[PDB]
Every structure is written in C-alpha cells, then in structure tokens.
C-alpha cells in the first residue's frame, strides 16, 4: 500500500476551464491527510455529512476529483441549492451530497496582465442542466421571432464570452480554484 | 500597413535634455496599447509599461521626479522630457504596441546625445 | 521578480552541436515569452505562451519548462549565428526585463 498521490491533483498546473471541466478516478492508496492538515493554507473547507475530526479511520468506496478556475462571486455560487448564472447553466450541484470543497486564490498565478482570456463561460441557454452533467455545443441564439440562419446579425448572439482577471483586480473578482471531492460509504 | 513610427528624435547637444515623439497609424490609441522601452548603450533594455483602454496609467521607476506619461491624445505622438536625459539615458529609444498577443509589433528610435 | 542568466563562451566546429537556453528567477512565476535578437540591429519578434510561433520563423523549435527556470531547445541551421534570447514575465507589475550576453561565431 502506497501513496495515491494527491499532488498530481491539487499540485498540478493549468487545469480546465469551467465547462469542459475533468473528472478523475482514485483507487488503491493511503490517505495520509496528515500531509494535507501540515502543508495546506487553503483559505476555505467546508464538508457536507462529514467532520474534520472523525475523518481518518474513513474508508471510502470510490473517489472522484473535479477542478475549476472561477470568480470569487462563484466561489460562494458553488454552494448547493444556489441561484445565479453557475448553478443555472454550469456544473450544478446537488443537495444530497457527501463531499467536502476546497479553495485557494491563485492570483499570483492565473490572472495575467491584460487578462487571461482562455478561461471561457456560457451565458445563455433554453433551458437548466441537471446535476454533474456538461455541454460542448454551438447553436446561435435568437433572440426574435425571424431566424438569424445561423450567422450572425440581428438579436443574434454568440453564446461564448471571457473573463479578465489582471493586476489590482477586484478582490471579490479575482481568479480561485476550487476542487470537489465524492464518496460513498458502501464498501472498501 | 500597421505602422509605428519615430519622429523628432533627439540630438547631439551640451544641454542635458532630450525630447523624442513616436506615431502610430492604422490603429487607434482608443483601440490598443502602446509600451515604451529603453536601452543604455552596451546594455539589455529597461522597461516602463503601461495598460489602458485610454487614460489610465501605471508607473514603476527607480526615480519619477519630472515623470509621469506625456501623451498628445489625437493620434498625433507621444513625448518624453527630462533635464539630464542626455547623460543619464537614451542612446536609442524604442516604440512597441501590444495586443492580446501574437500581434506585437516593434520600431525603432535612434537618439544622439 | 529578479531573474538570472547564465551564457556560455564556446567555439564550433559544424551545425547540430546541441544548444540550450536557460533562465532562474528569484520568486515562483507563471507566464514567460520568448524572444530571439539578432546583434548589431534590435528589431523584436516573439514567441508566445504554448511556445507556439508567430508568423515567419522556422518550424523546430520546443519550449517547456519548470518553475523558477525556463527552458527550450534548438538543432540545427540559422540559429546558430541569429540567436540571442531574452526572458520576461508577465504575472505582475514591474515587468521586470532582464539582462545578459550571448554569442556564437
């Protein structure tokens, strides 16, 4: 029995946008958090039908690891049960949940001077996504009763815009990264 | 063609000042951004930058007395003055401009002191 | 940022005599651009993050790196008398521009 490790998750560079985002499958390892309560300095935890204390001695049947970079207005949005432009289009999270959620501000590292513009987020849609589930898609929206052919024009939007995040940006603003962990309690 | 261009630039003289303009042509001062970088004569060139969609400004400096951008906002030219620049600076000054990226764009300046 | 430059002083004897370029900072930095000068004029082409080209430059070239030092990597032709690199980075003010000296005849 060995380490999993964990670094490649949280340690690793350039992680996905907010739609299109990964998901990744643990197995076979040592928890070992004692290496995450010394090292970490995450500005937040919060873990949902579970404790900080009475968290070793937990076996886990199946781990899944998902990574994000958002503004820190979304950072509060990633709370279950939530209203907004997150929790309507992208990455909805359910209620009846068992993980725990983590966040770190990485401002010294995504932002960028003249904005970071690969970090992409969608603005419109017919309707609301259910839970843990994503869309790669383009079908131009119309906002009026004639057709605008699938080109652009009038009342004819692009569904796709991008976040800036600079120097001396707004700190409620500025980029986080945030990480969502999932268990279950049924097996070994 | 998109074009950056250098116009009036300093010369030989006893007094210690130095005055240089740079131009700019098929875009708009509105519409992107221009940087401004220096080099000393047997030497890697030294920085002042800037980012703006128009009026802003940003400074570093070892020194800023008498310094702050000196900018003729109608597309005409950017200006730069100081008393001991001849001594203290500019064997050549150069003029950039910056985009999102991969559309940067360089001139060049030749100041005699 | 500080950053820190190390050059070689070398003698050829032909082509595809391997060739490196490297650069430390003081504090951990996250973007860097990549630029090719060639002596005795000062025009400025670039290349970008991903390390991809701009327009007009040969095709073998490859950048990757690791933190507080920067790393790419060239074989073969014209390089050899056009190359003279620069590093900066482009996290936080002041964009620090560095400095040193490199030469092959």
């Known amino acids: 029995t060995n380490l999993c490790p964990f670094g490649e998750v949280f340690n690793a560079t350039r992680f996905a946008s907010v739609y299109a985002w990964n998901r990744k499958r643990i197995s076979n390892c040592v928890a070992d958090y004692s290496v995450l309560y010394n090292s970490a300095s995450f500005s937040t935890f919060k873990c949902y039908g579970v404790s900080p204390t009475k968290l070793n001695d937990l076996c886990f049947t199946n781990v899944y690891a998902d990574s994000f970079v958002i503004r820190g207005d979304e950072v509060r949005q990633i709370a279950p049960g939530q209203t907004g432009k997150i929790a309507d289009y992208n990455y909805k999270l359910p209620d009846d949940f068992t993980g725990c959620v983590i966040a770190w501000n990485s401002n010294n590292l995504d932002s960028k001077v003249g904005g970071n513009y690969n970090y992409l987020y969608r603005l419109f849609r017919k309707s609301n996504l259910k839970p843990f589930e994503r869309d790669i898609s383009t079908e131009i929206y119309q906002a009026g009763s004639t057709p605008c052919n699938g080109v652009e024009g009038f009342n004819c939007y692009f569904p796709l815009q991008s976040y800036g995040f600079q120097p001396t940006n707004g700190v409620g603003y500025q980029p986080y990264r945030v990480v969502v962990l999932s268990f279950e309690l049924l097996h070994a | 063609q998109v074009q950056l261009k250098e116009s009036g630039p300093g010369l030989v003289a006893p007094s210690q000042s130095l005055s240089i303009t740079c131009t700019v042509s098929?875009?708009?001062?509105?519409?992107?951004?221009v940087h401004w970088v220096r080099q000393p004569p047997g030497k890697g060139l030294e920085w002042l930058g800037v980012?703006?969609?128009?009026?802003?400004?940003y400074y570093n400096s070892a020194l800023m007395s008498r310094l702050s951008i000196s900018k003729d906002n109608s597309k005409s030219q950017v200006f730069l003055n100081m008393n001991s620049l001849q001594t203290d600076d500019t064997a050549k000054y150069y003029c950039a401009r910056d985009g999102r990226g991969y559309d940067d764009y360089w001139g060049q300046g030749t100041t005699l002191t | 940022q500080i950053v820190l430059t190390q050059s070689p002083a070398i003698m050829s004897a032909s082509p595809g005599e391997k060739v490196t370029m490297t650069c430390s900072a003081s504090s951990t930095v996250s973007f860097i651009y990549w630029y090719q000068q060639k002596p005795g004029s000062s025009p400025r082409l670039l290349i970008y993050?991903?390390?991809n080209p701009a327009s007009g430059v040969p095709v073998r070239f490859s950048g990757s790196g690791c933190g507080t030092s920067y790393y790419l990597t060239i074989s073969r032709m014209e390089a050899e008398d056009a190359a003279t690199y620069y590093c900066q980075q482009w996290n936080t003010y002041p964009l620090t521009f560095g400095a040193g000296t490199k030469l092959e005849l």
């Open positions: 993050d991903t390390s």
């Open positions: 980012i703006w969609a128009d009026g802003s400004t």
């Open positions: 098929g875009f708009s001062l509105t519409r992107y951004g």
